[PDB]
Scaffold this active site. Structure first.
Site, PDB file in Angstrom:
ATOM      1  N   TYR A   1     -11.647   7.413   1.697  1.00  0.00           N
ATOM      2  CA  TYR A   1     -10.943   6.218   1.148  1.00  0.00           C
ATOM      3  C   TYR A   1      -9.737   5.723   1.945  1.00  0.00           C
ATOM      4  CZ  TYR A   1     -10.028   2.995  -2.777  1.00  0.00           C
ATOM      5  OH  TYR A   1      -9.813   2.255  -3.430  1.00  0.00           O
TER       6      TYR A   1
ATOM      7  N   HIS B   1      -6.082  -5.685 -10.754  1.00  0.00           N
ATOM      8  CA  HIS B   1      -6.011  -4.388 -10.070  1.00  0.00           C
ATOM      9  C   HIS B   1      -5.850  -5.017  -8.751  1.00  0.00           C
ATOM     10  CE1 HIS B   1      -6.954  -1.471 -13.150  1.00  0.00           C
ATOM     11  NE2 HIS B   1      -7.909  -2.371 -13.449  1.00  0.00           N
ATOM     12  N   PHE B   2      -5.148  -4.218  -7.717  1.00  0.00           N
ATOM     13  CA  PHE B   2      -5.397  -4.616  -5.983  1.00  0.00           C
ATOM     14  C   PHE B   2      -5.127  -3.190  -5.497  1.00  0.00           C
ATOM     15  CE2 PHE B   2      -1.007  -4.247  -6.595  1.00  0.00           C
ATOM     16  CZ  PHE B   2      -0.281  -3.981  -5.300  1.00  0.00           C
ATOM     17  N   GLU B   3      -5.685  -3.051  -4.100  1.00  0.00           N
ATOM     18  CA  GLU B   3      -5.585  -2.031  -3.363  1.00  0.00           C
ATOM     19  C   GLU B   3      -4.360  -1.623  -2.566  1.00  0.00           C
ATOM     20  OE1 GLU B   3      -8.221   0.372  -2.955  1.00  0.00           O
ATOM     21  OE2 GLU B   3      -8.448  -0.639  -5.191  1.00  0.00           O
TER      22      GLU B   3
ATOM     23  N   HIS C   1     -10.050  -1.881 -18.502  1.00  0.00           N
ATOM     24  CA  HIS C   1     -10.533  -3.091 -18.981  1.00  0.00           C
ATOM     25  C   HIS C   1      -9.403  -3.735 -19.826  1.00  0.00           C
ATOM     26  CE1 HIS C   1     -14.186  -1.721 -17.324  1.00  0.00           C
ATOM     27  NE2 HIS C   1     -14.357  -0.832 -18.134  1.00  0.00           N
TER      28      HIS C   1
HETATM   29  N1  LIG Z   1      -7.088  -0.582  -7.243  1.00  0.00           N
HETATM   30  C1  LIG Z   1      -5.843   0.118  -7.290  1.00  0.00           C
HETATM   31  C2  LIG Z   1      -6.492   1.612  -6.930  1.00  0.00           C
HETATM   32  C3  LIG Z   1      -7.887   1.901  -7.338  1.00  0.00           C
HETATM   33  C4  LIG Z   1      -8.475   0.972  -8.021  1.00  0.00           C
HETATM   34  N2  LIG Z   1      -9.902   1.527  -8.073  1.00  0.00           N
HETATM   35  C5  LIG Z   1      -9.748   2.906  -7.579  1.00  0.00           C
HETATM   36  C6  LIG Z   1     -10.793   3.865  -7.355  1.00  0.00           C
HETATM   37  C7  LIG Z   1     -10.449   5.077  -6.709  1.00  0.00           C
HETATM   38  C8  LIG Z   1      -9.559   5.199  -6.315  1.00  0.00           C
HETATM   39  C9  LIG Z   1      -8.262   4.116  -6.379  1.00  0.00           C
HETATM   40  C10 LIG Z   1      -8.606   3.199  -6.869  1.00  0.00           C
END
Ligand SMILES: NCCc1c[nH]c2ccccc12
Length: 305
Positions: free
Chosen positions: A123, A279-281, A249
């Site tokens: 990741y 959501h963002f990364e 959700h």
């Molecule tokens: N998107 C913010 C962190 C995140 C979203 N989906 C995930 C899945 C696995 C780990 C982190 C995330």
């Protein structure tokens, strides 16, 4: 408190992380269909740079939005340059940890497992420019990419933190039983690594050096923390996707949070449209700009602030 926003439409979809090379012209970003592209500039646009997958090919892979294409095409979740030797580390969900030279192309695979337990969903990745050591994260031992709902439903706590050491070619496990570790970053002085545990709402600090070596401790707590990226000041930006209804959700109140090596909040920036409500990364500072990586938008966002 002003916001200027730049929206750069990308090829594929979902530019979710960035890294930058010695020349420091344009940027690199990883996208839905398995490529890492490189942005040259406005005139020049985006070009292919690298592919994790040995098998990435254009007809079948390019601009896919089908998740059942990922096992062959790959999906890369993070990229980080080694500036001294112009080399890019990649962590991909399906092709794991690899690296590529200045020239790009299909990546060379470096590790698929640690302690006899295969990686399921790598990741986050980062290069410690001083040691040349690579720190990275695996979000699960059970579920991959297409298993997010399960991760949340079981509240999966099998995440891992590893180091890779180019010179010895050895992968070492540093922490196990992490609560969905979606972000990791090394300190400027190489003394500690940080990991965000998503489902625990915390940044954890793991010591590489000093008397507390080999030990971890909660550094600060942040709602739904994602990617963490160091800036030139040695501070840390992390994405916070506050799930106000306690699950993916309901409503989401996304902010970028900058903090320091002692768990002090320096800055909070709520995301504007189009990232608002979602959501963002990643948020990454580079040259006074804030890069916004996401898993659901088709454009790079850059904030000037
Ligand atoms: N998107 C913010 C962190 C995140 C979203 N989906 C995930 C899945 C696995 C780990 C982190 C995330």
């Amino acid at each position: 408190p002003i916001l200027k926003e730049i929206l750069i439409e990308a090829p594929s979809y979902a530019p979710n992380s960035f890294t930058f090379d010695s020349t420091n012209k344009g940027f690199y970003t990883s996208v839905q269909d398995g490529r890492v592209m490189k942005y040259e500039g406005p005139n020049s646009g985006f070009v292919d740079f690298a592919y994790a997958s040995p098998y990435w090919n254009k007809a079948f892979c390019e601009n896919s939005t089908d998740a059942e294409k990922r096992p062959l095409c790959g999906r890369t979740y993070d990229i980080s340059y080694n500036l001294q030797n112009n080399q890019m580390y990649i962590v991909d969900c399906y092709y794991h940890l690899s690296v590529v030279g200045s020239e790009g192309g299909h990546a060379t695979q470096l590790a698929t497992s640690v302690d006899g337990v295969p990686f399921k969903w790598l990741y986050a990745v980062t290069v410690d420019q001083r040691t040349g050591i690579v720190y990275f994260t695996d979000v699960s031992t059970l579920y991959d990419d297409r298993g997010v709902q399960q991760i949340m439903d079981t509240s999966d706590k099998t995440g891992r933190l590893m180091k890779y050491d180019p010179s010895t070619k050895e992968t070492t496990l540093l922490m196990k039983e992490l609560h969905v570790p979606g972000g990791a970053e090394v300190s400027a002085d190489s003394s500690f690594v940080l990991v965000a545990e998503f489902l625990s709402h915390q940044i954890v600090k793991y010591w590489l050096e000093g008397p507390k070596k080999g030990t971890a401790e909660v550094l600060v707590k942040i709602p739904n923390p994602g990617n963490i990226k160091r800036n030139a000041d040695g501070h840390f930006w992390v994405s916070s996707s506050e799930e106000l209804d306690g699950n993916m959700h309901g409503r989401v109140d996304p902010k970028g949070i900058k903090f320091d090596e002692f768990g002090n909040i320096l800055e909070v920036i709520p995301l504007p449209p189009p990232f608002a409500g979602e959501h963002f990364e990643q948020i990454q500072e580079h040259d006074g700009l804030l890069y916004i990586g996401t898993l659901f938008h088709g454009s790079v966002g850059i904030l000037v602030y």
